[PDB]
Paper text:
To investigate the molecular basis for Bid, Bak and Bax BH3 domain binding by VAR F1L, we determined crystal structures of VAR F1L in complex with Bak and Bid BH3 domain peptides. Unexpectedly, VAR F1L showed no detectable affinity for Bim BH3, and only weakly bound Bid from the BH3-only proteins with a KD of 3220 nM. Superimposition of bound Bak and Bid BH3 backbones indicate that both ligands are bound in near identical manner. In the VAR F1L:Bak BH3 complex, residues V75, L78, I81, I85 protrude into four pockets in the VAR F1L-binding groove, similar to the equivalent hydrophobic residues in Bid (I86, L90, V93, M97). Close examination of structures of VAR F1L complexes with Bid and Bak and VV F1L complexes with Bim and Bak did not reveal major differences in BH3 domain binding to the canonical binding groove that can explain the startlingly different ligand-binding behavior. Nonetheless, despite the inability to directly engage Bim, and the very modest affinity to Bid, VAR F1L is able to counter both Bim- and Bid-mediated apoptosis. VAR F1L protected against both BimEL (P=0.006) or Bid-mediated apoptosis (P= 0.0027), with comparable levels of protection observed with Bcl-2.
Residue numbers in the entry:
A (entry chain A), C (entry chain A): 64 to 201
B (entry chain B), D (entry chain B): 81 to 109
Write the structure that this text describes.
C-alpha cells in the first residue's frame, strides 16, 4: 500500500491531482460553513485523539501493524467496534477507535471505500454515550 | 479473529486513558 | 441544501465533527505523501481553475444556480460531460468541468455520493487530451 | 435537458478561455 505503486502512469498522477483538488476544496468550504458549535467539537476530537495517539503511541502502532498483516472487511471492523461500544461506555475507547479508523483511511488508496468506512464507522462511534461526553467536555 | 483482538486492544487503551483522567472531571467517567 | 438544516441534533453535530476529522486527517496525510510531480499538477489545477472561476465568474454562477433549480443524477451529469469531451479537445472545457463538479460537491451533504461523483467525473475529465495538456504546462 | 444545456455552457466557457490564451503557448491549443 505504497503511494508510489499507485502512481505508475501520468494519468494516475493527474487523476490523483484532480481528485485531491475536488476533495480539498470541498472540505475547506465545508469547514468555512460550519457552525461554531461543530467547530468546537472538531477541536475537541482533535485534541483528545492527539492525546490518545501520544499517550498510547506504541499501542496504536501495534494495532496498525496488525491490521496490515491480515485482510478483513470494513463490515466486520464495524461490527467488532459496535460490539465493544455496547458494553464499554468509556470515552477513551471511542477516541481510540476514531484514531484507528482514521489511520486505516490513511492507508487506503480507494477513495470511495475510504469514505464509506468513515461514514459507517462515524455512525457507530457517535452513540448517545459519545454525544454525552462531547457535549460535557465542550 | 484478528479484528476481535484489535477491538479488544482499543477498549483496553480506551479504559486506561479514562482511568488516567482524575475522577469527577468528566461526567460518566 | 443549507448546512444548518442538516445539523439539527447534537448527534448531527458530533457525527459531522468526526467525519470531518477523519477526512481532513486523511487528505493532509495524502498530500504529505504525494510525489513532487503530483503536487505540481495539483498547483496547476488550482491556478488554472482559479482563472476560469475568475474570468468567467458570472457564467459559472449561472451554471450553479441552474443545477439548483433542477434535479438530475451524477450518472447523467457524467455522461453529458463525456459527450462534450469527446468532440471538444480544448483545455478550458476540462478546467471548467472540474470547477463545476467541485461546486456541486460543495453543495452536496452526502459524503459517499460526493466522493462517488468526484471519482467518476475525475475518470471522465482525465482523458489523454487532459493529461497531454497538464504534462505540457507543468 | 438542463444537464445538456449546462454541459454546452461549460464547453463554450472552456473554448473562450482557450481562445484568450495567446496562440502557440500551449501545444494543442
Amino acid at each position: 500500500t505504497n503511494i508510489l505503486d499507485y502512481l505508475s502512469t501520468e494519468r494516475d498522477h493527474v487523476m490523483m491531482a484532480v481528485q485531491y483538488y475536488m476533495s480539498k476544496q470541498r472540505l475547506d468550504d465545508l469547514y468555512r460553513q460550519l457552525p461554531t458549535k461543530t467547530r468546537s467539537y472538531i477541536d475537541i476530537i482533535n485534541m483528545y485523539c492527539d492525546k490518545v495517539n501520544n499517550d498510547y503511541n506504541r499501542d496504536m502502532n501495534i494495532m496498525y501493524d496488525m491490521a496490515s498483516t491480515e485482510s478483513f472487511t470494513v463490515y466486520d471492523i464495524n461490527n467488532e467496534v459496535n460490539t465493544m461500544l455496547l458494553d464499554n461506555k468509556g470515552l477513551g475507547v471511542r477516541l481510540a477507535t476514531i484514531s484507528f479508523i482514521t489511520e486505516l483511511g490513511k492507508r487506503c488508496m480507494n477513495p470511495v471505500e475510504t469514505i464509506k468506512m468513515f461514514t459507517l464507522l462515524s455512525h457507530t462511534i457517535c452513540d448517545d454515550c459519545f454525544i454525552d461526553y462531547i457535549t460535557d467536555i465542550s | 479473529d484478528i479484528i476481535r483482538n484489535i477491538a479488544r486492544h482499543l477498549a483496553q487503551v480506551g479504559d486506561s486513558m479514562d482511568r488516567s483522567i482524575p475522577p469527577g472531571l468528566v461526567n460518566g467517567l
